[PDB]
Amino acid sequence: SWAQSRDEQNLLQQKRIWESPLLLAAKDNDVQALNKLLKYEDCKVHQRGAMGETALHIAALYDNLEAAMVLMEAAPELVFEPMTSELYEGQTALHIAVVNQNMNLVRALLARRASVSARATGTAFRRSPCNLIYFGEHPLSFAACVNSEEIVRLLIEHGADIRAQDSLGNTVLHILILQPNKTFACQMYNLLLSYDRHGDHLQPLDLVPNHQGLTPFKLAGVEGNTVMFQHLMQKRKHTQWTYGPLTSTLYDLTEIDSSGDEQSLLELIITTKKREARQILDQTPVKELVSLKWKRYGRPYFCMLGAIYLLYIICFTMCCIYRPLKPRTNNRTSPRDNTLLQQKLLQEAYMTPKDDIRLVGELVTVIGAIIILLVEVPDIFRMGVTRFFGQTILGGPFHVLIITYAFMVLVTMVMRLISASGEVVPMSFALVLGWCNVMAFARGFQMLGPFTIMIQKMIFGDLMRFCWLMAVVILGFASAFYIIFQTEDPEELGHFYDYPMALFSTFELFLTIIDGPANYNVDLPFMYSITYAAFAIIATLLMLNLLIAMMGDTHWRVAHERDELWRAQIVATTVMLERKLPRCLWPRSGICGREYGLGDRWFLRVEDRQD
Amino acid sequence: SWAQSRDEQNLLQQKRIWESPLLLAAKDNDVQALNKLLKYEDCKVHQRGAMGETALHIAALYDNLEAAMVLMEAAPELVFEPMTSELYEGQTALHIAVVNQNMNLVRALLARRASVSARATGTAFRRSPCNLIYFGEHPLSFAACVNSEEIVRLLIEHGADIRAQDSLGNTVLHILILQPNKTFACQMYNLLLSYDRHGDHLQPLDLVPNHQGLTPFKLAGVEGNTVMFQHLMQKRKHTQWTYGPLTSTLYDLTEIDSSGDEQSLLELIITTKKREARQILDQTPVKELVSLKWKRYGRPYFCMLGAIYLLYIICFTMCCIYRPLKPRTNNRTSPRDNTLLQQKLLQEAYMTPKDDIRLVGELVTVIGAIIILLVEVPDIFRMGVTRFFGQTILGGPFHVLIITYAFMVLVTMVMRLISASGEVVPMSFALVLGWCNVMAFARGFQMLGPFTIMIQKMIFGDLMRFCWLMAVVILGFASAFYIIFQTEDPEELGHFYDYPMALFSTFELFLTIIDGPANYNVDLPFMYSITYAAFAIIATLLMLNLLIAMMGDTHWRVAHERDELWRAQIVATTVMLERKLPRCLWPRSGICGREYGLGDRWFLRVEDRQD
Ligand SMILES: NCCOB(c1ccccc1)c1ccccc1
Ligand SMILES: NCCOB(c1ccccc1)c1ccccc1
Numbered sequence A, B: 001s002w003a004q005s006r007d008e009q010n011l012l013q014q015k016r017i018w019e020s021p022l023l024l025a026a027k028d029n030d031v032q033a034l035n036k037l038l039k040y041e042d043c044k045v046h047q048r049g050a051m052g053e054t055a056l057h058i059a060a061l062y063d064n065l066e067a068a069m070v071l072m073e074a075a076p077e078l079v080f081e082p083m084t085s086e087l088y089e090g091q092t093a094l095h096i097a098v099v100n101q102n103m104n105l106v107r108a109l110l111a112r113r114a115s116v117s118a119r120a121t122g123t124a125f126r127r128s129p130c131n132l133i134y135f136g137e138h139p140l141s142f143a144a145c146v147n148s149e150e151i152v153r154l155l156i157e158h159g160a161d162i163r164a165q166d167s168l169g170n171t172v173l174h175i176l177i178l179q180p181n182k183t184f185a186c187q188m189y190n191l192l193l194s195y196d197r198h199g200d201h202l203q204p205l206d207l208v209p210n211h212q213g214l215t216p217f218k219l220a221g222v223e224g225n226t227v228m229f230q231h232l233m234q235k236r237k238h239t240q241w242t243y244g245p246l247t248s249t250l251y252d253l254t255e256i257d258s259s260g261d262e263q264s265l266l267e268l269i270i271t272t273k274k275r276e277a278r279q280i281l282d283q284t285p286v287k288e289l290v291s292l293k294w295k296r297y298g299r300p301y302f303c304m305l306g307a308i309y310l311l312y313i314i315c316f317t318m319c320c321i322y323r324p325l326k327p328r329t330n331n332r333t334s335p336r337d338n339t340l341l342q343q344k345l346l347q348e349a350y351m352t353p354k355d356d357i358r359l360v361g362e363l364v365t366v367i368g369a370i371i372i373l374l375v376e377v378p379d380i381f382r383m384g385v386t387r388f389f390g391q392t393i394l395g396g397p398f399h400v401l402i403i404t405y406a407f408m409v410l411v412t413m414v415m416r417l418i419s420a421s422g423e424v425v426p427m428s429f430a431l432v433l434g435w436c437n438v439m440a441f442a443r444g445f446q447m448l449g450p451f452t453i454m455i456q457k458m459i460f461g462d463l464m465r466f467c468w469l470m471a472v473v474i475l476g477f478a479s480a481f482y483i484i485f486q487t488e489d490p491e492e493l494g495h496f497y498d499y500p501m502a503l504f505s506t507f508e509l510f511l512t513i514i515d516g517p518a519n520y521n522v523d524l525p526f527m528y529s530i531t532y533a534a535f536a537i538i539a540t541l542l543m544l545n546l547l548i549a550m551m552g553d554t555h556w557r558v559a560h561e562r563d564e565l566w567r568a569q570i571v572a573t574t575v576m577l578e579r580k581l582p583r584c585l586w587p588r589s590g591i592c593g594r595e596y597g598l599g600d601r602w603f604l605r606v607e608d609r610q611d
């Protein structure tokens, strides 16, 4: 219950101004009552409000230069007094001066030589969803947000440093990026480029990283400020000759492609969470770049890894179906004559000329697990375990269960060396999601991907949400069937002889898979005949409602936004096999420079056609 | 990896201008540095760039007449020097002159009497999807594309030949057709008609074929430049009397209908691949023309061929169900008591008075195959075998399996003369797609067609795309069921006694047909009870997702574009039974001329109503 303290103190603002007749005249334009306040006696200049205010704080906050200049002969040092703490740590009147777009107080508090080096790093000033705004803390950082032109010109003419950085290391240029009024603040980008003039030996400010290592170029990408990205792009592209309707411009491509792990661009559009950012893939240098990364040595060296993979599964299944598999030897099946099993999975029979063939069929698989184990000993070391789930679901949640493939297929070889009876429990799991993970490769072969994308987005958000609701409407009828047939002999009509199978038999009855029980040779008890019917009108309702649960997402799908999610998925493939596959088979994308007056920067061009 | 060489040489353009101070001044407006370049010494006039450039090439390409005229006293012969090779084979400054819409250099390089006979047949200039533009190679061919009026007037006043043809034989008039800015280039059609004046004895240019035999009338049709087609149509139609709101105009109809195999119009809208072309059927002379070809002696002589066809199938099925069919005579069924068969298909029993009736019931069918064999001995000779598949899917993919009907129904008579045991393997196939091909005739009977059209577009693009995805999610569970019931006796619960039926029994379980395997008399092994359930929540997912896989196409369907695909399908019928059925029963469409001051051209009229 944190946010209550915001408001408790904010009414305490209205408390302290209420008791104070000086601050009562700081509310409105009571300059003639300010004449009644300062010339008649010595009131102290430190009349602190709820979080430590003075008059020109309150006066400029309630839009009053007329109350602001009359304290100047009263107290010139109160410009040097910031607001105290805990929400507004270091806030001065200069900062709220530009909040109200002007009052000409900006020259007037600069007539008391106010300091732009004041940093208001308080609670409400850092980036958080509990604060509905974000501004940085330097005053010129605020003036970029408010889109007030000559105000920015005014303070740089009085000693403003543009290269100053926030609590996170973001300069003022980052702060212009994170404004939700995007094109309306775009015009102040090049204005703040216009005061770069002294070229520092480290940066001309547009390559400045923050303490999360983001130059504000790609910070616009990882936030997805799309229209600002283009205006930022146009200075960086190097256009060559134009040929009538077409133009052979030439894009920069320095930080865009993967280079030596400097947190390159493409992995950051993947690993972010804000889904408006993925529309940066619809921008002119980027969509065609990933196309050539996907057309040439994209899918055919991807699907080649797919091609060996189902062969790995085929050589798994043949060494899965041929099993030790002896006849029934220890005992006859005594209990109940229900133990309908005879096979018992042999201890140490391998020397036959069939069992050598399965052995080379075997150990290729368990070593093949250890290959995809060694994929993850750096990769679990890379992005943790618990937030690795936070890496999964957005792009490749098929990646995680190929590892639970490996846990089971390793433990079943541990199982065969011990030869315990519980052998099928891995071998069930180790077979089914082996095949179920070949649909991860459906993205590579064309036109087959997007349903498998839509497979993903229906199961993890809708069907498991449905399976919450479905797993309780069963348990009524299932247990209601279970008690209603405790009365009856399970010799005939034996679906419900005990409670654990009574759930399962109801469950498969729920999907209308089983015939619907009914002897028709004896009588059935009376409430069976309606409750099963009372299950039926539910069975025709909610799975039919589940059929249309699909549709309310599907109108939000393909007509609008699965097609982007397909190619958003294709690049989550792209940087990841770029990373995991080492060099000397991938040549990195685009043309290299260094032979053409360009140097170490590699480039990429495209044609077009205008009007 | 071909397209890399485009860019490697295109940076080499920027390499050669970089080393050359003459070409450095050819970049921008360095005429005072051109004073520093030519008057002071004799620099050679052949300073070749990457693919062989000179200065006025580079100057006019970077929009500089001011650099262009200063080399004229330096080198007047460099107009006669084309760009060298391998991309731009024969490109001169005259060609790039009209690319930049003007510079008044067009008169100025004609002051050195430049040649419009220059043909730039280089790599980037022919029609290809690797080139984003298409222009032809004569300079007047370029000026039609750029839509620059008096520029076209200027060069014809200096010796331009309009009748010149490209590498493919297309003249300049074809080049105006293939511009993607369609109405914006439409105004230059009649302008280039306006300089026809000398009537040549062969053509007045608007009947010129190319080396694929396309007069640029129907070339607009086969590409589907719809709005240009109408403006091209209006001069060709011959309007008669107007009666207030109605007008009895009279359309030309020379090349539109099928005539003596001169690659007529209607078959070309069918056999093309670009699906924007089929909207030429929505144009005023064409839609009503095919209507009268379909209303009168269209369907009733089509459905008549349908009417004999199911009678052929009925007289096939009666000679399919009555079979030789002897009792069990060679041996008792010894193995396993599973060989539940007794019939063995008699060798040479035909003389009974029932078996003569099936014999006349027989040989009508195998001869009836040979009729639809003789349809194809010219037709396989017509359009090949492998690209005949490229004829199938767009219109009548039902046509191909009536031929695999014929292969099987021929081989089963080969089979009865040998009387091998494998008799049902054709007879299964020869029966099922015999009936399944009567739905080809669903297009003829009204309102029944479009679902059978939608049958086609769901199976060959979506369900076989689904059956990729579905055939792997089965094999997990199916083999997982197969290993989990290797343990168990297949006497009771015998769905999965071996692997080949284990797939099929899972497959029909997947569509929730089979009952779902459960004895309820014995115990079942433990991972059966969840993995079958783990099959169930997939079984309620993806075939339910397949249900809505239909819908994302269906919103792209009937609300917008199946109704055109229906009548696009009806004319693919129309020219084909026009072709395959010979004369003396079809009278060719429209009214004949030759009695009415019109001659050999046959015509067709229509009424209307305007505002
Ligand atoms: N095979 C290793 C799994 O890695 B996958 C993956 C790796 C990093 C981030 C997200 C997913 C994956 C890659 C392509 C397709 C499916 C999954
Ligand atoms: N019966 C011969 C098959 O020819 B069909 C056909 C012929 C040429 C091109 C495409 C298809 C066909 C014609 C009408 C309906 C269905 C198929």
Ligand SMILES: [Ca+2]
Pocket (backbone or CB within 6 Å): A514, A515, B514, B515
């Ligand atoms: Ca049943």
